[PDB]
Structure formats: structure tokens, C-alpha cells
Amino acid sequence: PNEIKVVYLRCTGGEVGATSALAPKIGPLGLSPKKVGDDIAKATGDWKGLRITVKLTIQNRQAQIEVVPSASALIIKALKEITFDEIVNIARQMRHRSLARELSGTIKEILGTAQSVHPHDIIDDINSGAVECP
Amino acid sequence: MKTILSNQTVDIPENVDITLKGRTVIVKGPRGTLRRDFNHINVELSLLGKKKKRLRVDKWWGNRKELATVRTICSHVQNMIKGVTLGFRYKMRSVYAHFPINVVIQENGSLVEIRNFLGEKYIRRVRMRPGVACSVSQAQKDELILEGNDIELVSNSAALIQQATTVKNKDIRKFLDGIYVSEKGTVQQA
Amino acid sequence: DRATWKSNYFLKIIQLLDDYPKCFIVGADNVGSKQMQQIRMSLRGKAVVLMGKNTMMRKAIRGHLENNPALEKLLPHIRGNVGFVFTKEDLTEIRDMLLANKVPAAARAGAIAPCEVTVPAQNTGLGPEKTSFFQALGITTKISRGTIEILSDVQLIKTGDKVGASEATLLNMLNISPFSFGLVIQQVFDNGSIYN
Amino acid sequence: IIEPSLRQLAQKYNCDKMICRKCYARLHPRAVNCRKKKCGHTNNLRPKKKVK
RNA sequence: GGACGGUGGCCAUGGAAGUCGGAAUCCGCUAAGGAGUGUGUAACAACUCACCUGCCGAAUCAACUAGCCCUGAAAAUGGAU
Ligand SMILES: [Mg+2]
Ligand SMILES: [Mg+2]
Ligand SMILES: [Zn+2]
Numbered sequence: 001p002n003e004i005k006v007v008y009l010r011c012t013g014g015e016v017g018a019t020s021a022l023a024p025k026i027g028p029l030g031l032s033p034k035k036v037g038d039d040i041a042k043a044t045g046d047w048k049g050l051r052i053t054v055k056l057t058i059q060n061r062q063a064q065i066e067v068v069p070s071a072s073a074l075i076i077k078a079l080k081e082i083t084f085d086e087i088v089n090i091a092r093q094m095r096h097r098s099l100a101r102e103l104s105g106t107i108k109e110i111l112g113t114a115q116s117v118h119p120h121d122i123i124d125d126i127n128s129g130a131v132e133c134p
Numbered sequence: 135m136k137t138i139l140s141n142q143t144v145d146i147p148e149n150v151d152i153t154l155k156g157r158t159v160i161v162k163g164p165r166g167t168l169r170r171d172f173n174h175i176n177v178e179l180s181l182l183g184k185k186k187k188r189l190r191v192d193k194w195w196g197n198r199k200e201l202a203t204v205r206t207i208c209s210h211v212q213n214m215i216k217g218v219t220l221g222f223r224y225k226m227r228s229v230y231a232h233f234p235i236n237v238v239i240q241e242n243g244s245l246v247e248i249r250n251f252l253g254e255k256y257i258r259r260v261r262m263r264p265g266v267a268c269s270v271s272q273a274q275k276d277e278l279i280l281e282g283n284d285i286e287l288v289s290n291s292a293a294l295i296q297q298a299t300t301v302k303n304k305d306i307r308k309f310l311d312g313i314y315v316s317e318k319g320t321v322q323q324a
Numbered sequence: 325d326r327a328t329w330k331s332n333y334f335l336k337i338i339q340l341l342d343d344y345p346k347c348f349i350v351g352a353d354n355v356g357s358k359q360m361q362q363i364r365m366s367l368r369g370k371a372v373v374l375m376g377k378n379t380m381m382r383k384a385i386r387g388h389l390e391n392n393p394a395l396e397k398l399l400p401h402i403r404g405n406v407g408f409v410f411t412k413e414d415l416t417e418i419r420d421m422l423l424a425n426k427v428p429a430a431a432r433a434g435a436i437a438p439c440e441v442t443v444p445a446q447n448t449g450l451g452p453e454k455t456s457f458f459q460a461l462g463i464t465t466k467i468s469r470g471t472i473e474i475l476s477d478v479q480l481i482k483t484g485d486k487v488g489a490s491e492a493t494l495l496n497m498l499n500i501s502p503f504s505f506g507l508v509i510q511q512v513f514d515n516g517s518i519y520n
Numbered sequence: 521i522i523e524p525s526l527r528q529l530a531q532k533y534n535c536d537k538m539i540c541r542k543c544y545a546r547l548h549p550r551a552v553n554c555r556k557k558k559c560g561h562t563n564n565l566r567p568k569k570k571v572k
Numbered sequence: 573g574g575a576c577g578g579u580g581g582c583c584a585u586g587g588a589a590g591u592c593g594g595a596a597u598c599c600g601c602u603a604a605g606g607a608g609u610g611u612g613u614a615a616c617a618a619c620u621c622a623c624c625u626g627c628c629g630a631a632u633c634a635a636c637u638a639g640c641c642c643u644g645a646a647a648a649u650g651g652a653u
Contacts, residue, residue: 009580011589022586025615054580054589072598073582099578100361100601102368110578113598114607117582123598229526296533307571310522310530352626357576357605364601376603377625405573405626407603433618435573460523489524493618542643560643572612 004030006059013053016042032059041066049078070095072114085122088115089129104133136195142208146187150219152211154179159189159211163218165321166283170214175203217283221321224292225271226278228299228313235299235313237278243267246278251299252311258298263287268295278313281321289318333376337384340374342391344410348418349398350509352405354435359427363507366425367409371418375407394516401518406510415512415519422509429504431487431495439503443480448472450497457494538565 008029012021016039023038033041041057041064048068055068068074075091092107099107108129112119146152150163157179158171172179182188189211191204216222228235236249246268248258262268262280266287271277278295282288292315299312341347352375360375367373381402389395411418431437448454452472458465465472481491495502512519522530538547542559546568553561 011580011585011587020586025586051582052585069578071579071581073579077582096578098365099599100364100576102600106600107578108599110599114578114581116596116598120598227526227529229522229530231522305571306534307531307568310527310534312530314529314533316529352573354573357574357601360574360603361577361601368601374602375625380603403627489618557642562643 002061004032004059004061006030006032006057006064009054009056010041011052011054012042013045013055014050016046018042030059032061033064037064040064047078049074051077072111073117076111076115085128088112089132093133103130105130107133136197137193137201139192139194140196140201140204141190141192142204143182144189144191144208144211144215146189146215147219148187150215152181152187152189152215154181154189159214161211161214161218163215165218165221168214168218168283170210172207172210175207176200177204177207179207213285216320217285220324222282222285222288222318223321224280224288224318225316226280226292226295226313227274227316228276228278230276230311231309233311235276235311237270237313239268239270243269246295248295248299248313252301252309260291260294260298262291262294266291277316289315330380333380334384334388337374337380338388338391340372340410341385341408344372344412346412346514347408347410348415348509348512349402349406350409350422350507352407352507353505354429354432355506356427356429359429359506362427363425366421370413371409371411373407373409378402378404378406381408397516397518398513401511409509415514419509422507426504426506428501429506431492431502433487433489433492435487436484437481437487437503438484440483441481441501441503443474443478443498443500445474445477448474448498454497457490457497461490461494535568535570537568539568540564541566 008026010023010026012023017023018035018039021038023033023041024035027034027038045053045055045066045068051074053068053074054071055066057064057066070091076088079087079091088111089108092111095107097107099110101107105126109123109126112123112126150161153160153162156171157173157175157177158169159179160167160169176193178192178194180190180192182190191207193201193204228237230252233250233253235251238247238249239245240247244262244264244267246258246260246262248260251258263282263284264287265284266280266282268291269279269281271279280288280292280295282291295313296315301309301311350373363373382399385395385402386399409418409422447468449471452467452470455465455472458472463478464475466475467473481487536549538549538551539545540547540554540556540559540562541564542562543554543556545554545556545559547554547565551565553563554565555561
């Protein structure tokens with residue numbers, strides 16, 4: 001595995017942080033990124049989203065790329081700054097979309113009340129877009 | 135409330151026989167004979183058949199406290215059957231942090247000497263109950279084997295050994311040294 | 325709630341057994357919820373799997389047996405942690421895939437291991453700060469290139485014995501393949517037929 | 521040094537127990553009421569505190 | 573035995589990932605699972621619970637209530653149904 005691997009996740013986002021962040025505390029696990037690694041990771045991780053932004057990174061032995069899983073609350077807080085049905089319909093297209101599913105409506109039922117932080121009348125009597133995604 | 139009748143039946147194996155002399159049960163099996171009287175309990179003991187040897191304990195017009203005694207008598211008789219057929223063997227382990235506990239088994243397993251419990255110069259002489267033999271196990275490095283026919287005698291001897299090695303004036307949650315009953319089982323495993 | 329749950333369950337069982345004519349009764353060993361999700365995803369494409377209360381199963385297949393005969397001969401055989409997989413495919417195609425998709429279960433503490441495994445003499449590949457478990461178990465390990473090396477073959481586990489916590493955590497950190505088990509077919513039922 | 525299984529055996533008799541809040545009696549770990557009259561067989565029990 | 577996926581759910585952040593705290597209680601797999609009753613890990617992790625299932629095959633559980641008894645209930649010369 002190239003003698004070192006970067007499977008570990010992060011829970012930092014929004015402000016750059018750097019020294020205030022725990023990235024120097026992760027540092028001794030791999031010794032590769034250090035400050036010149038977490039700064040350049042945060043450079044691409046400034047947005048998508050502007051929140052805690054739990055995300056995974058992949059190491060190329062010199063630089064890191066970052067992929068942010070499509071967390072429901074993360075993406076809805078990124079969207080926020082009403083129904084807004086279409087944006088939550090389209091936000092689930094690029095996710096992992098497993099959710100122990102049996103139909104496409106399960107994911108939108110999940111996110112409709114994940115937005116509850118009332119978005120429950122739709123959950124009660126929804127009759128739209130049951131097979132929209134497939 | 136007085137219950138009219140509370141009875142319980144214990145089956146007797148073929149290799150062991152039981153004789154009643156009033157409320158005195160004499161259980162003779164391959165390993166020996168265990169005799170115990172229950173004259174302190176007002177129950178009726180009966181042997182049922184010449185075929186399978188059921189022993190029935192009956193209590194008539196008993197309240198709750200003396201209904202509690204029927205299964206006690208039955209369990210005691212089952213323990214007697216178990217003792218005369220397979221016997222009782224208690225395995226104890228001596229645990230120590232720094233000072234090893236040296237155990238010497240004196241004549242015929244009837245006396246146990248504990249030498250270096252917690253490094254003190256006192257010698258603990260514990261005498262086993264009659265019919266109970268103590269030995270040093272050859273399978274484990276720190277293990278005592280107490281074998282006998284009477285479960286109460288064997289377990290009382292084990293309790294004497296356990297209570298002899300008691301840490302005093304110290305935190306017992308930290309000074310865990312002593313001899314403790316590791317397991318209870320039978321001999322011959324049959 | 326409970327009564328409606330049981331009634332809906334009865335309706336589901338009767339409609340499923342009417343819909344699907346071929347079903348294999350399959351025992352569930354010490355299997356996890358992750359394995360349940362994996363089997364559900366890997367099997368929901370072509371067939372369905374059912375794993376609930378055995379009393380529910382017997383009552384559903386006994387009380388409402390009048391709709392089709394040649395079913396009561398399952399009754400003296402549905403015992404233990406077992407369920408029904410309903411399929412329209414055939415026995416070999418179900419059996420080979422279900423015997424192939426066995427997740428390599430680890431060595432959970434407190435679990436019996438009828439199978440036997442033995443650690444070989446090879447480098448661990450981890451840092452030399454985990455010698456405590458090896459020394460507690462009684463394993464001779466020495467430093468070599470900054471990694472822990474097993475210099476001698478030792479007996480790890482026998483058949484039919486309890487697994488200690490130290491052994492379980494050793495097999496957890498060793499990243500090797502321990503004894504594993506999963507959902508195993510007990511027998512079959514194809515329109516009133518019992519085979520292996 | 522004590523190996524973990526022997527430590528567990530010792531702790532079964534020394535540490536894994538209940539204490540009555542009224543009379544400090546040492547009770548079996550599954551106790552619900554104290555066995556002693558002087559506290560009135562009270563059900564005010566707590567775990568024996570650990571060395572941790 | 574399982575006690576999950578999103579989710580190491582959001583705002584709290586220096587780790588709080590189910591449990592140092594503020595809100596809300598989603599969905600699906602279903603046999604069930606609280607985006608958590610507790611232990612605890614610096615934190616991970618590892619346990620436990622409520623929830624279901626397996627073995628077990630006949631009744632069981634909970635909260636109150638009030639009779640006698642017990643605890644509550646310690647004084648001086650030796651003593652008073
Ligand atoms: Mg002191
Ligand atoms: Mg009084
Ligand atoms: Zn008490």
C-alpha cells in the first residue's frame with residue numbers, strides 16, 4: 001500500500017484553522033502532510049461546504065485531494081444561507097444512494113425529515129416523484 | 135393460604151440405591167454412602183417403584199415458608215446422588231502478584247499449609263472436613279483439587295481455604311492475593 | 325401496534341408463500357446486521373429472503389395450509405434459528421452464490437471455534453509497540469527492521485474451545501483470516517420436496 | 521503481576537459486588553435488597569467502587 | 573445471537589463519533605435497533621441497556637394499597653405487660 005495510507009477521515013471545515021485545528025494531531029500518524037499538507041488540503045476544502053464538512057482525503061505522496069461525502073445535513077446547510085423540493089430531489093443524485101434502499105422514494109423520505117432541523121406533511125402524504133430518479 | 139399438597143419427585147439412577155429410615159435418607163452408590171436426616175422438616179418421603187426408583191417428597195397443608203423446603207430437600211437428595219455416583223471436585227487457584235503462595239498438602243490430604251501468603255512468616259494450617267481430600271494439581275502450576283462425596287463438606291473445606299488467605303488492613307480491590315474457588319464439578323465426568 | 329404488526333406479518337408470509345413456489349429453508353448462525361444488509365442487497369435483485377420468528381413461521385404455514393396441500397411436512401423440521409429464502413431460480417444457482425458470498429467473520433470474544441487455524445512464521449508489518457499481547461500470550465517476538473517478527477511456529481487455537489480476550493484482540497490486530505461462518509442452507513423445498 | 525483470567529477470578533470475590541448505602545454490607549452483584557435487618561432490608565444499593 | 577446504513581446525523585469543538593451540552597426523532601433493512609438507558613475510551617475503540625430472534629414449553633409481570641412483624645429506636649443504681 002505504498003508503505004503508508006490515508007484512509008482516515010477528517011471533521012474540520014469552514015475556517016482554515018490550521019494550527020488551531022487537530023490536523024497537526026493527526027500528523028504523527030503518517031508524517032507526510034504536516035502543515036504543508038493540511039494547508040493545501042484546506043485550500044481546496046474551504047467550500048463544499050462551509051460547515052464541519054466531514055470528508056475523506058487521498059494522498060499522492062506529495063499532495064492530497066479531498067472528496068466530501070454527500071451528507072444530508074452538510075449539503076442542506078451548504079444550500080442554506082419554503083419547500084425547495086427540486087434542490088433536495090437533485091442533491092441525492094450524486095450520493096452513494098444505498099441507505100439500505102428498496103425504492104428511490106426512500107432517500108427523499110430520509111432527507112425530507114433530515115431537513116427538520118414543518119417538513120413532515122410531505123412525509124405524511126407524498127405522492128410525487130416516486131420513480132423520478134430511476 | 136394453606137396449599138393442600140405440594141410434592142416433588144426425584145429420579146434415582148440404576149447404579150445407586152436409596153433407603154429411608156423415617157426422614158433419614160441413606161444413599162449408597164459406587165463411590166460410597168451418604169447419610170442425611172431431614173427431621174427438622176415435616177415432610178413425607180416415599181419410595182415409589184421397584185422399577186425406576188422415584189423418591190417423592192410431600193408437604194400437606196403447608197404455608198409459603200414450608201413449601202419452600204420441598205425443593206430444598208429434593209436438591210439435597212440430588213446432591214447426595216451426584217456425590218455417591220460422580221463425586222464432587224472443587225478446583226481452586228492461588229493468585230498472587232509478588233509473593234508466590236506455597237501450598238503443602240500434609241497427611242492424606244487432610245491438612246493444608248499455606249506458607250508465603252503476602253510474604254508473611256505466618257503458616258496457615260487448615261484442616262479439611264472428614265471425607266474431603268486435598269491435593270496439588272499436576273495439570274496447573276497453582277491449583278488445589280478438593281475431592282469428596284459430600285458437596286457441603288467439600289465446599290466448606292474450600293471456603294476454609296479461601297477464607298484463611300484473607301488480606302487485612304489493605305485495599306482488597308488492589309491486593310487480590312489469595313486462593314479462590316475456580317470451578318466446581320465432578321470426578322469421573324460421567 | 326403489536327397486534328397490527330403480527331397481523332401484517334401473517335399477511336406478508338401468506339402472500340409471499342403463495343407468490344413464490346420454491347423456497348430453501350436456511351439456518352442463521354452467529355451473523356451480523358452488516359451481513360444481513362449485504363445479503364439483502366446481493367439477493368434482492370433476483371429473489372427474496374425471510375428471517376423472522378419461528379412461531380410465526382409455523383403458525384402461518386399451519387393455520388392457512390388449506391389453500392395448498394403438500395406443506396405440513398415442513399412443520400416437523402422448521403426448528404432453530406432458521407428462515408426461508410424464496411426464489412424462482414434453481415437450486416445450484418442459489419446454492420453456489422450463497423455459499424460463495426460468505427463474509428470472513430472475525431474472532432469475536434466468547435465464540436466457539438469448531439474450525440482450526442494456526443498462525444505462521446511471518447512478519448506482522450505493524451510497529452514494535454504491540455509486544456505486550458504477544459508476551460502475555462507467551463509468544464517470542466524480536467525486533468527486526470522496525471517490525472515484529474514471529475520467529476517460531478506456535479499453537480494458536482484448537483477445535484471446540486473458547487476464545488480468550490487476548491487471543492481475540494491478537495487475531496483482530498493480526499489482519500489475518502480467522503474461522504468464519506455465515507447463513508447456511510439447511511434443506512430445500514420445491515413444490516413439496518425435501519433434499520440437501 | 522496477575523494474568524487477566526486470574527485477575528477476573530479474584531475480582532469476582534473481591535470487587536464485583538453491591539454495597540448497601542445504609543449499612544455498607546457487601547452483597548452479591550445481582551442483589552436488589554440488602555440481606556441485613558439493621559438497615560431494614562433496604563433496596564438502596566450501589567456498586568462497589570472500582571480502582572479505575 | 574443481531575442491536576445497523578446514510579450518520580464519525582446538525583449547532584456546540586481542542587476529542588467528543590449515540591452518551592461534557594441545545595434543539596428536534598428521519599427514512600429503509602426488516603427480526604429489531606434509541607441518529608441512543610448506562611460503563612468507559614484523551615479520543616478511537618470495546619462493552620451494556622430498549623428492540624427483536626433462538627433454546628426453553630405454563631402461566632407470569634408491574635404499580636399501588638393496609639394488617640401483623642422488622643428497621644427507624646441513644647442515658648445514666650439492677651428491674652419491670
Ligand atoms: Mg492503609
Ligand atoms: Mg417497635
Ligand atoms: Zn444494608
